[PDB]
Structures are given as C-alpha cells and as structure tokens.
C-alpha cells in the first residue's frame, strides 16, 4: 500500500564519528537526505558511491577520498557531494566554475633528465574509460568482457615499436604473474580493503589482462581499477623519452579506439572520467623511484613534499611502506593542470629533492 | 529486471570505413549515441533512417544522400543528423537559420525555348506528401491504400485538358507496363538496391498506380517513391509550355486535395517534405534530354556541370548509364531556390551547354 | 486521446489473390485479425513474419514457404499460422501433437557409397542458432557481432583434422570471394528478392564470415542466412565419410559452444529452430551433384522426385537453373525424421535414380 | 500493439462544403488536426463540441454558432477554435486580448418605459452555470440531479416578493405544462434538431424543472439548456421595473447559492460561462414583443435591425416564425458590454423602432 | 527506446570452469537464463546470490556452498537453483518433497558426557533471523540497526542465570575485543574473502555486538553473519548441561522476541531461514574441541569422519588449520534432523572417536 512509511533518510545515515577520509569530512545529513533518492540511469546510488569510504576510515599511509563513481552520470547526478570532495582533493580546483585543459606534447617538456644515482626508475601512468560502459565498481560481467574486447581489438592495430601482445590473467600461471608483479609490470590481486569494499574485485580474474610491448616499455592494464590504465616505464632517469613514448602511444591507442566507434569518457569540466575522484582530469601520475642511500637523510620530509605538491608512496604498491628508504615520488594533483605541466612539475620537484639531499651540508629550504 | 544492461550505443555503431555517401561522412559516434534512443511518434528510428546508407556505400553514377525519412517528424526529431546532410547536399543552404520560399508563376519565366536539334525532350517533376500519413519507407498497407484513395478521389475532379484516368499497377498487363516504361512515362519496379534497402518496395505492386491525361502530357505517379509525383512532359524543347501546364495542374491538384480536408506536408524551414533529403524544398527537377551527336564532343564535362549546379544522368533512369551520348541534364539543388528560379537556372544552363557545341571551334569557358 | 480509432485489421490485410506460396495459402482474415496485435518480446510482429511471402508470390523453381522467424518466441507466439504451414511443408508432420527426435550416429549409416560416374560430389549441411540472440531477419548489428564473436571463439578451440581458420567477408578481396563461390565453398551476396525482402541482407558484409578447415572439407558460414551453417563437403560419392566427418565436427562445435555458456536454440516439439520454417527440425540437407550425360535422358522426373521426397535444385544453388543437366538432388523434408534416417533416405533415392539410368532399356517404375 | 496506425485526423475531418454556421466557417484542417487529440479533464472532445454544427448546416431563421461547451475547461482547451467563433459572433470582441466587465445596477438605467400600444410585453433573461458540474451537453444523470438539488435548496431561501415554489417537470401533467408553455412561462420539450444533436435532451424530463414566484414575474428554469436560466417578465412596456426586479432577484439567488459553498462559472476574460458561445459574457437577453398592426409596415427591416445590433425572433420560440407581425426584438451581442449597457441599448433600439411607425410619414433613416 | 537490445543472459554467464563449490557444480546456462530476470521484492537478484561463489572457487579446508540469501523470499524465488544445492549439501534431504521438524527437549538427550581427557570443551550454536528484515548480505544500515534494537530490547528481559549484558562492538577497545576473540567468545572482523564477497562486512563495526551472561556460558552475536547467533559454551565435556541451558535460553529468547510482535523466519519446508544454505533447518552446530595428544594418531581420519557425517574444523575458526592436532568436530548436516537427534549423533560420533584412540592396539573400523 501507499500508506506504508519508508525509513527516514537519517535512519540510514552512516556513523562517521571516527572516520578520516574526505567523504566523511564533506558528508552532512542534509546532503545525504537530499541525494538518498537519486540514482544514475544504470542504477548507481549514493550508498554505493560512499560504501568504500564508510567501510574504511583509515588506510595508511595516505589520505583517501572514500568515494568511487559507478558510471559517467555519477559525477553529474551526485555533484552536490563530489564537487566539494574534488575541490578539496585537488588543492582548490573548482569543477563548478573552472574548466580543464589537456595537452600531450613531448616537445614542450625539454630537459627532464634525472641523475642516475638517485632515480634508477621513471614511470608515467594514466587511465581511460570507454563511454557507454559502467565503471569497474558497477560493471557487470558482460560490460567487463565488452571493455576487454574493445581494448584488445583496438590494441591489435598497434604497429612498430609499440607492437605488443595481450595476456589474459586467467590464462597466466601463478608463477608468471608473481614474476611480473615483482618486476613492477603486472598488477597484484586486489586484496586491499579499499578495492574490495568498492566492489572492484568481483569475478576476479575474469576479463582482466595486461597488454605489453616486446620491450615491456609500454603496458596497458585492462579492467584492474579502470577500463584501461596506460603505462610507460623505463629503468632509468630519462623521463623525457618515457613521456614521449607515453604521449605517442596514448595518441595511437585513442585513434585506434575511435576507429571502431568507441569514445573515451570525457567532459571539459572534469577532464577524463575515472572511478576514483582523485584520478579525474588528466588522471596522470608521473613518478620515479629513489636510490636507497641518499633521501634517507631527510627529517622534515612531509613538509617539503606537501610544499611541492608531491606524494611519496613506498616501494612498489601504494599499500606498501618504504624500507631502506626508496620512495616512489609523484605528483599529487591531476586535475586543473595539463599533462605537460604536471610532468614539468614532477621534474622540478625531483630536481629539488636530489639537490636538497645535501649529503655534505645541512639545512632544509622548503621554499614555498 | 531493471538491473539488466543494454548494448552500449557504440556496439551498434555501423562500420562505415569504406562508405562514400553523405550519411557516412556526417555520422559520428557522438551523434549516433545521442540519437539512438529517440523515435518519431509513429516509431521511426535512426537505424531505419540510415539503413539505406549503411547498406549502400557506392551506387554510381552520382553521389547519394544515404538517408530517408519515415514521416514528417523525422526531420525534426533527427535534425542533429539531417541538418548537416541537407546543408551539404544543397550547396550550403542552412535549414536551422534560413527559410524557403516557393512561387509557381509561369509568367515570370519568359523565353525558355530550346533548340529542337539538341533537346528533343523536356520534363518537369515534383513530389508531394499527404500530411498525417507515413512516408513510403515506413507506410503500412493501410496507409498506402489511404494515400491512393485520397489522391485518386482528388484527381477525379480534374476537368478540361487536365482530364485523365487512373491505372492501377496491379491491373495492368506486363506488356502495357513495359511499353509505358520504355516511353519514359511509367516507373519501373524498384529493383535498385537503394530503394529496396530503404524499404520502399514492400507489398509491390499493391496500391501503386499512374494517373495520366489523355495526351499523356500530365502524369502523376501514386506511391512509387513519394505519396505523389507530379510530372509534366513534352517531346520537344518548349520548356515554357511544359512549365505552364505543370504549374496550373499542380495548383488544381492541390486545390482538389485540400477540398476534402487533406493538406500537403510542408514547413517554411524545409519547404515540401519528401522521403529523400535530396528532394526537400521545392522537390522540383526540370530537365531535358540531349541529341546524340553533339554533346559527345565534350571532354571536361563534369567541371562545367558542377560549375552550373546541374546534374547529368544517363538516358531514362538515374540508375542507367549514357550510351551514344544523350544525357538527361537537370538542376542539382532543389531547396533554397524557388521553382521559377530553378527553371530559369536550368534554361540558362542548357543554353550555355548548347552554345558550347564546338562543332567549328574549340575551347571550354567554364565561366564560374 | 483514447477515442481515436485504429485502422481495422482487415484494412491491413495483404492482397494475396495472385500469390503462390504456403503463407498465402494458409493465411485467412480471421488468423490475421487474431494475430495482428501480438508481438514477440523482442518486437517481432506478424507483418514482419510474412513480408517476404507478401512481396514474393512466385520465385521459381521451387515452392516457397513465404515466412521467416525473427526469434525463438515467434514459432510459439504466431503458432496459429506457423503450425499449418509447417505441417504442409513437412508432409504431414504435426508440431502440435508429434515430437521430433535427433540422432547423429555415423555407425548406423552403413554403405552409402555412390557411383563415381554419376555423383562426383557429396555435401551435408545443417543450421544452428544461438539462444538468446535474434535471428538474421531481426538481428541488430550488436547481435550479429555477438553471434560472430561467440562462434569464432568457440571454433578457435577445434583441433586436429578439424583445425581451421576464420575469414571475415569484409577483409576478403572480391577476387578471392568470387573464386570461393565458384568452387561451391563460399556464399554469394544475397541479391535474390526472397532474402532481401526478409531483411536478411542488412549491413552486408558486416559480421559475416566463413570458417573452414585446411582441406576445406569442413566449413561454417557465419551470419549468412542463419547464425551458423555447418557444411561438410567432398568431391566424390563417398557420402559415408562426409557424414561421419559432419557428425563428429558438429558434436565438437556444439561442445565448444556450450563450454562458454551458450546453448543452441532447440525444443523437442520443433527440433532446432531456424529462420525459414522449411529448415526446422534437423535442418539437415544431404545432397549430391549429378553427372551431365546420364540423368538428362529422363522425362517424368518431377513425379519420381516427389515420389522419393527429394528436391532437385540447380548445380549453382536454389536460385540457379540446371543446364547440361547436372542436378543437386537432396532430401525434401527435414522435420520429423532423424539425421541418420534422412541420410539413408537420400542414399536410397540416389541409388534408385542412378539405377534408372535408362541406358540399356526404358521404362519408369516410380515405385510409390 | 504500438505498431498499429490510427486513422489520420484528415480522415475524420467533417464534410462542411454545404454548411452555413460559424463553426463551419472557422474550422480548418490544420485546426482540426491540432485539436483532435486534446480533451478536457471530464473527457469532452472536439468532435463532441462541433457535433451540433456538423449535423445542422441550416436552422433558419437566424445564423447559428454550431458549437457547444461540455464544461468550463472547454473554452480554454479548445480556445484555438472557440476564440475566432466568439469574436465573429460578438461583433469583434477579442477574448484573447480584452476583458469583460459586469455590472447589475438598476439605478443607472433611468427611463426605459415603452409605449403600451407597441410592446405589450417585456422580458429579461440570463443564464448561470454551477462551477464543478458538467454542462448540459455533457452532464450525466448524477450531475444533473446535483445541479437541481443545489438550485432548489438555494432558491428555498428566497423570501418576500421573490418567494416562490419549485415544480418538477416529471410531476406536472401534460395539460399544465402546455398551458404554461402557451403563456410564455415554461419551456417546451427540446425537439429542435440543434438541441438534440448537442445532446441536451438526454434523460428528459429527469431533473428538469421550473421555480417561479407567486405572481410568476420571476422564474428560473432548471436544467433546460443551462444549469439555470433566470427570467423576469411583465405583460407591459415597463422595462424599468422588470430589470430592477431581475437585478435584485439575481443578486439574492447568487448570494444564496454561494451560502452553501457553490460558485458560478465565471472568468473575467469571458464573463459567465454557458453552453452556447452566443450566450457568453453577461448571457443577458432583454426583449419585448411588438403589437401586430404597426411594425408590419416595415420593408427594409433586416438592414435597420443589423444597424442597431438587434435580433428579431418570431413570437414565442426562436424556432418559430412571425405571423401577423409581432416580433420578439432583443439585443444581439451579450459579451463585451455590461448588463446595464445592453438594457439601455435595447431601450434605445426599441424607441427607434416605435418612432419608425411610419403611419403618417415615410423614410428609412437607418442612422448607422 | 524499446527497440534497444539487452545483453543476452549467456553473455553474463559466469566463467566457472575452475570452480570447486556446489553453486558452480549445480549452475547451468539454462538455469541462469531462466532466473536472471527474477528478483525478490526487496531487490535481491541471482547474481547477488552467487557472487560469493563466483569470486571464491576454493577456500580450504572444507567444501563451500558458494551461495547466500538476501531475504526470506530468495529461497522461494530462486528455488530452481537453491533446491539442488540444499539437497546435495544436506545428504539427500529434498526440500521440494520432505518437511523439517524441530524439537528442543533436553529430557530425551540422556547421557552425553565426554571424557575430560579428550574434549576439554563443548559448544552448541544456532542462528535466527527476524522476519521482515533483510539478511546480512542485503541489509541496509537502517535494517541492521533495527535488528540490533529488537534483539537488545528482547534480551533485556532475560532474568536469573541467563541475565547478562550487551556490549556494542563500536564501543569496545581493540584489546578487549582481541581478548574475547582469543577466548573463543567474540567473533573476529570478517576478513575472509567468502564473507567479504557476500557483502556481509559492510559498515563494520556498525550495529554489531555481543550479548553475554555474567558467567559467559550464554552468548548471542548480533549482526555478525546472521541477525542473531545463540551460543552456549562450557570448558569441559558436559554436553548435557550445555545443551539444556541452550534449549531453555533459546526458548526464553524466542518468547521475549515474540512478546514485542517480532517473529523468526521459519517455514516447515526449510526450517529456520538463514543466510548460508548450509545452515538451513535447525541451523544447529554442536561440537567439542579435542585433546592434543590422542587424535593425532589417526591416519584414515577423513573417511571415518565422512562416515559419521561429522565435520572437522581446525582450532578456533573455520578458516584456521589444526596444529598440534586439536580438532573442532561437529555435525555436518543441520537440515532434515531435529536438534535432539543432531546432538545425539554428535555425542555418538565423539564417543566413537575417543573409543578409537588406539593408544594400545591398532585398527580402524569405520563401521558404515
Ligand atoms: N617509478 C616507478 N618505477 C617502477 N615501478 C613503479 C613506479 N611507480 C609505480 N610502479 C609500479 O606500479 C605498481 C602499482 O603502483 P601504484 O601505487 O598502484 O601506482 P598507480 O597509482 O599507477 O596504481 C607497483 O607494483 C609498482 O611496482
Ligand atoms: N527529360 C526527360 N525526357 C523524357 N523522359 C524523362 C526525362 N527525365 C526523366 N525522364 C523519365 O523519368 C523516369 C525516371 O527518371 P528519374 O531519373 O527517376 O527522374 P526522377 O528524378 O523524376 O525520378 C525515366 O524512365 C525517364 O524516362
Ligand atoms: N552437393 C553439392 N555439391 C557441390 N556444391 C554444392 C552442393 N550443394 C550445394 N552446393 C553449393 O552451395 C551453394 C549454395 O547452395 P544452396 O542452394 O544455398 O544450398 P542450401 O539450400 O543448403 O543453402 C551453391 O553455390 C552450390 O554450388
Ligand atoms: N418578450 C417576451 N415576452 C413574452 N415571452 C417571451 C419574450 N421573450 C421570450 N419569451 C418566451 O421565452 C420562450 C423561449 O424563447 P427563446 O427564444 O428561447 O428565449 P431565450 O433566448 O430566453 O431562450 C418562448 O416560449 C417565449 O414565449
Ligand atoms: N567447540 C568449541 N569450543 C570452543 N570454542 C569454539 C568451539 N566451536 C567454535 N568455537 C569458537 O567460535 C569461533 C568461531 O567459530 P566458527 O568456526 O565460525 O564456528 P561456526 O562454524 O559455527 O561459525 C571461534 O573463534 C572458536 O573459538
Ligand atoms: C587508494 N585509492 C583511493 C584514492 O585514490 O584516494 C584508490 N582510488 N586506489
Ligand atoms: C537515388 N536516390 C538517392 C538520392 O536522392 O540521393 C533517391 N533518393 N532516389
Ligand atoms: C528459398 N527459401 C525459402 C524456403 O526455404 O522455402 C529460403 N528459406 N532460403
Ligand atoms: C439556437 N442556438 C444556437 C445559437 O445560440 O447560435 C442555441 N444555442 N440555443
Ligand atoms: C564458510 N561458509 C560457507 C558455507 O557455509 O559453506 C559460511 N557460510 N560461513
Ligand atoms: Mg595504484
Ligand atoms: Mg527517380
Ligand atoms: Mg541456400
Ligand atoms: Mg431559447
Ligand atoms: Mg562463523
């Protein structure tokens, strides 16, 4: 009957009195009550958006957004809660007013070569979603298989240096997968509670895979945390070559994908849409590992790092710590700046860090 | 259940990598995704609109639109795809901004007499659709029979020189139909793939017919490719008389049709609505055949023809080629210009063509 | 408004006064009125079922059903019209009461070797539809591509003698396709009016292909007239080996298809569901070509052939005639009998025909 | 099914080629097609509005509107057709633009006494509808009974000179009803085709009645052609007393009706809503009979009458003619002018008419 | 539009080619296709039912069902898949035909005392669900809080020896929770993949708690894996006292719950409804730990255990192994047998096990 009463929204309000994530900070009873009825056309709802944040109050060793998007419409349907979170996460970028600009030019990134005694590794990463298909948090098996087929068919057209092969996770022996993971190429099974709570580990390892070139300098993860994750890696400090290869490969992949009538998720307000609001905009993360004996001498590291808008993850894996200090240092903000700008910022920050080692003298300049 | 997922629009996107029609040129994944859910009140959909273009990439010896309209609402519902196609097809006429004006006056078409040694035939054609009834691509049997009844009842009222008789295709012996076709009067069965793919050959020959006057100088095809096709023909170069008869007969037919409460499809933005976007506006085609020994001497013909906005089809039938060169030359653009203007343009172009007989001198002037 | 009146069903009733197909014979105003509102869950309707029959009254040189099915549900939704047609087409088999049994055993088909001087070719064909996907008359582009992907992935698992390769029609040069067609391997473009009117030529050649083994003795047409057409052919009279290979290959293909969670359309009442009601049940056609000088001496062929329940097509296919008499003789009925029974019947009929070479004496026995 | 086609609106368009009513004049195929889907909340439709006009092309001896309203919403829902009709019927009043003002003051109508030798009868009539109840063309039995109950209960409260009694038509002997009709008090059974075609004779004589005061100078017809018709009569030429009594009685009746929570249909754009668009606005008709020997001498009567905006009906009954000339002369326009203005206009026109007795002189002044 | 096509069910079919759980064994494409549209009134669907089984193919050291129920209606809506699974899991009990009988009598369980040198612990467990509230896999925050409130209010009425207190998990320090877990009283956080994949760890630790008596011999877990889990423990081999206390406490709890108008989920076909089909029927598990030096001598243990219908989990925790062999031995089947019968079976099995200590002789009797 229509006379039956629903549970009032405040009855469903999560208990976030001990949470320490941006979703908990920016969620209020008014917002929850306002948004608890809405839903994206594919059925995504607010509770599904904030489940990962609700279940995970902590997760060292970095601050977490606590939200995910089930599809493109989410960021528009639940903008009343995503917008403040995005603004806080990206040092003040305002999606409501500002616009995002993307440029991928390896010409305007001159220099960008690091000392081989302090870097010994350079990687550039980005993510891409296929329009019309639900994101990993909400995708069904059919949608995941469709994403895999589209990506594999597109990548089959890559020729020349970028030519490579696709390896299905379900067809790889555990030893091979472990060897690939230990080499920083493949992705590990999603056991971290943040991924599991978001629902981005359903049906594992179905429809997940890795497409890599023969030199393994150009890789593409299929269906791990986004529809596609494009990676360009090199064991050294030559960020210039890595970024040039990344740019050309990404352009070719986009062209091949569009050839078949598929287009990436994108809007000028937010840039490239991805699951985690922390990856919006360019979704780009350019970083380098650090030599063990050197940066270990730092004492006021976090202040300097927040000074330069850089983030320091441990060795391979965000969930891992740093032992025998070798830190993966990358840019912190991915929205509001162009890819070239982000790479230049990373290069400048790393040059500062290696210059700030000061193994002969003492003194931290910070230099806000 | 509502949790089941539909095929993403890009999955249905046609493969037009080898097509050479305006629909293929102006169709993009964004447009297809935007329009793949809409539908006219009678159920016409985008796929039905573009089926003929998808199936037919070629079709010599002229460029083809590759689209058809199922009803009046189509041009409004799918305007996002029809408008660029119409603009390209009609040398820049912009339906969004401009307006179309129609005038049928035989007084302001002074002159217009061709040399009898180079024309020997003059025809004028137009199309008309009855409002409220689906177009041939989408019409059911009941709608087709209704169109036939309305047209026949209206035409029964014609008196005087225009007085004529209606002949039902289903009641005509094959020999009589073949004789009429060979005389350029009747229409042949629609075997060309463009007509069949559009669905404009369903239930043949049911409800199709030809109404012609005793002299056979005035004819009306019922349910061939439009609801009505009004034709005025004469074996000679006297375009003036042909056009005068065409104008008066068309006015009388329109009056008789409106007498019973039926009105033609029409809107000032597009003019007279017809199935093929190439026939919008006036839908008028005025043309003449050409004497065999004469125009055969031409070498740079296509450049001159595109110069004058004229189209050259072979002998009887667009699908046929030209042998022993005798070309059917007509106007190319039917929207944005009035009927009088189009006829005057055809007369000027034909006078230019005959003036360039070059049986005693050489040189092509083009004269853009 | 709800006060508006629909066209009465009799207004839409087709004009079949001159038709000569089973649909025209068994269609009555009462049946049409009863069924003109129903529709299968995918939207198939009666008019779409009978369009091919309505448009085509003739089509030599064989009697035609005049109907097609858009999906599995059709045969159940429109049973009131399909059942009499099926019963008449399959010499009295009653789908309402009887049941169909299928057995594919090459052991119980002993003998089956024809004289090499009168056969010189032996082929066995069947069709199969993937459950859950619309049939070629109604399938959209996405469904056709899904069928192609499922079939190709399944067939990739065939090993040993059956090992083969898939060739996409869109990627084959016209010369190669013509050579394959002339060799009786590949299928030609569907230009015959029966196929076009049924809508089984939309989006050609998208998603159509041929998968064949290295010896080309085992072929599979993908998306030509059914979802799959499995063919086993040999240039000779050894029907035994051909049928054995056909049986084992079909079993392997079915196993591979089921491995991935796809099941063939099938119900014990009708057997294997296919587009044309003439292919229901087993859908099997076993046949042989005939030597030119020999059977040409016959005069009362049609009576004998109808006596033996055999069909006589042209050497080039159903749509071609027989010149320099070389007739493709096959079984006529495919529903109500098992595959082994049909093959044995074909063998017995061919042995009877060759026994009646009438080179020594004369006289036709008929032998009903 | 949704694929079935409705009859196109032009198929339902009435055949008005021989009609002579305002509805026929102002009805066009475009208007009919536009309005043939709409309907008032109570279910009234355009065909029901125009049925009376369609069935009746003639009806001497006056020009007829040819339309009726089923409820209050009609004039708003079908304004596209009622507005031109109202404008033509009320000599230019434009309901879209201008507003209507009502005043009932017997003080500002000084004079207004006619010669007893040329009038011998004075009547004033008006109509009123109860809001929330369907009009007589569309009212069901329950609604008609509700109207009767509301009106009778209200009128029971009248006191003093206006005190009277209610007589139910179903409880009155035929002789009494005939006597009342012959005295110009009661209304006759609705046998005229205009009333019957409009559906305003259904369930006769159920729920119809007459409430009159003891002197029979104040009367109220219940459910004859409107919900209420208030009438004030006097056998003489004293229009002043008749009109003041009419005003006070109408005010008292309105007060009593509003006492119980019922309000009259009214909007400033149109005034008081009634069934026939010819009665909109005030709905007031003030008139007088004429002595037999006197006005019979007129020859150019119609021109003069149209000059003064007066209408001449025969003796008792609009449907009746004038024998032994005694004409009922009243105002022609009821909308756009106030009641006092209309009464003054009638008085001036009657004074003009009697002044033109022409028993001793000659001249048709007309005096536009 | 309604012309868009859904993904065929076989496209969503899980890839279970390597799974080893009952759901994978008893899931077929036909069943999946049949059930993929249905849904319980609260929105539970088949994919949600089988997600835990799909994600987890293994999970030593016991065979897993691989399914869960979202609410009471699930077992009825998806019976076509639950029934075979239940039958296989409960050694042939047929829910379709048979009925379940429950009796909780401590009188008819005479004896039941184990040797203190081989048991040193005795526990009895059961589960209960509140009717009208979604099960832990599907319950929202409001429903979980409602379950907690109902259970706590009911348990507040327990008096006498059963008198106890409720401890909210969110209000207990980590040290206290760890101490309780190490003592085998409290439940640990659900980190095992089977619980997480089923969605039974959402919003942890909100609304989860433990209500225990002062002696801690009677405990009730609130919202861990069922709505309520009632447990009775004793550090010894006196199963008689444990079971009688369990019976009386359960009866009192049920009475108190029903006092407020709440009733347990129950139907005679299945008994007491719970999330995991392995806990249906009584949901009872009676077990004992085993002394370290003793049962370690066994070699053919699994055959004997399957002989006696007993299951051997490791030490505290099903997910944990057995080191220094001390096995938790309990009954294996909970549906089709009464609680008294199950406890007697457990007692007989444990007596057999201890009798087969073989510390003096050798030989395994099995004794099927
Ligand atoms: N600079 C680098 N050099 C080598 N490997 C890297 C680098 N940065 C990241 N990786 C590899 O990427 C994998 C996942 O790292 P993660 O923190 O998830 O980066 P992302 O943000 O791109 O997911 C790790 O296994 C790690 O080895
Ligand atoms: N100038 C002409 N003289 C004689 N016949 C003509 C002429 N133009 C067209 N026709 C006749 O019209 C028929 C169809 O021509 P088509 O190219 O379809 O013209 P339309 O554009 O009006 O369809 C042909 O059979 C042809 O004989
Ligand atoms: N027994 C046979 N031997 C050789 N070729 C054959 C045989 N049967 C069919 N074909 C070839 O297959 C092609 C299509 O045959 P068709 O008449 O469509 O058979 P079906 O009815 O099974 O489709 C033709 O080109 C024909 O040459
Ligand atoms: N001036 C008048 N004097 C007497 N009776 C009248 C007068 N005007 C109208 N009536 C009476 O009203 C009755 C109906 O007349 P009708 O033309 O319908 O007027 P209305 O416009 O009020 O309907 C007739 O029977 C007639 O006798
Ligand atoms: N016989 C027993 N004696 C002592 N503790 C037990 C016994 N059985 C179970 N437990 C305790 O119950 C907790 C959970 O046990 P579990 O294996 O989940 O039982 P269930 O299969 O009923 O969930 C463990 O921490 C364990 O210490
Ligand atoms: C660890 N996280 C959370 C974040 O991005 O803040 C991922 N989105 N992977
Ligand atoms: C041949 N065509 C295509 C076109 O007009 O371009 C017809 N519409 N008939
Ligand atoms: C030629 N036909 C018609 C028939 O089978 O009768 C095909 N279905 N191919
Ligand atoms: C006679 N008529 C028609 C009209 O008013 O024009 C009535 N409405 N009574
Ligand atoms: C470990 N399991 C699976 C099972 O019961 O089989 C739980 N339901 N807890
Ligand atoms: Mg990462
Ligand atoms: Mg043409
Ligand atoms: Mg064939
Ligand atoms: Mg009247
Ligand atoms: Mg447990």
From Swiss-Prot, chains A, B, C, D, E:
Q: Does the keyword Oxidoreductase apply?
A: no
Q: Where is this region: Cardiolipin-binding?
A: 1-24
Q: Which residues carry this modification: Phosphoserine?
A: 111, 156, 192
Which principal EC class is assigned to this enzyme? transferase
Residues reported to bind ATP: 121-125, 184, 229, 285, 313-318, 328
Q: Looking at the UniProt record for this protein, which Gene Ontology cellular component terms does it annotate, in alphabetical order?
A: mitochondrial inner membrane; mitochondrion
**Gene Ontology BP, a term:** phosphocreatine biosynthetic process
Recorded family membership: Belongs to the ATP:guanido phosphotransferase family.
Q: What is this protein called?
A: Creatine kinase U-type, mitochondrial
């Amino acid at each position: 009957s229509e006379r039956r009463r629903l549970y009032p929204p405040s009855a469903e309000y999560p208990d976030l009195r001990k949470h320490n994530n941006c979703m908990a900070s920016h969620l209020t009873p008014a917002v929850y009550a306002r948004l608890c009825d809405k839903t994206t056309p594919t059925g995504w709802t607010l509770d599904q958006c904030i489940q990962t944040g609700v279940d995970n109050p902590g997760h060292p060793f970095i601050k977490t957004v606590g939200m995910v998007a089930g599809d493109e419409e989410t960021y528009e349907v639940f903008a009343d809660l995503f917008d403040p979170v995005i603004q806080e996460r990206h040092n003040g970028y305002d999606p409501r007013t500002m616009k995002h600009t993307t440029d991928l030019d390896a010409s305007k990134i001159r220099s960008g070569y690091f000392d081989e005694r302090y870097v010994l590794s350079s990687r550039v990463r980005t993510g891409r979603s296929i329009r019309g298909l639900s994101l990993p948090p909400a995708c069904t098996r059919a949608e995941r298989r469709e994403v895999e087929r589209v990506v594999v068919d597109a990548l089959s057209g890559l020729k020349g240096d970028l030519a490579g092969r696709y390896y299905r996770l379900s067809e790889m022996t555990e030893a091979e997968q472990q060897q690939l993971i230990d080499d920083h190429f493949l992705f590990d099974k999603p056991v971290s509670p943040l991924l599991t709570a978001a629902g981005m580990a359903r049906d594992w390892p179905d429809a997940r895979g890795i497409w890599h070139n023969n030199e393994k300098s150009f890789l593409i993860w299929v269906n791990e945390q986004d529809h596609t994750r494009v990676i360009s890696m090199e064991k050294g400090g030559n960020m210039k070559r890595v970024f040039e290869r990344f740019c050309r490969g990404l352009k070719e992949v986009e062209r091949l994908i569009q050839e078949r009538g598929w287009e990436f998720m994108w809007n000028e307000r937010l840039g490239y849409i991805l699951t985690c609001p922390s990856n919006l905009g360019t979704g780009l993360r350019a970083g380098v590992h650090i030599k063990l004996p050197l940066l270990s001498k730092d004492s006021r590291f976090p202040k300097i790092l927040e000074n330069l808008r850089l983030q320091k993850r441990g060795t391979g894996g965000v969930d891992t710590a740093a032992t025998g200090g070798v830190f993966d240092i990358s840019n912190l903000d991915r929205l509001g700046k162009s890819e070239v700008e982000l790479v230049q910022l990373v290069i400048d920050g790393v040059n500062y860090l290696i210059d700030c080692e000061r193994r002969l003298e003492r003194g931290q300049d910070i230099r806000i």
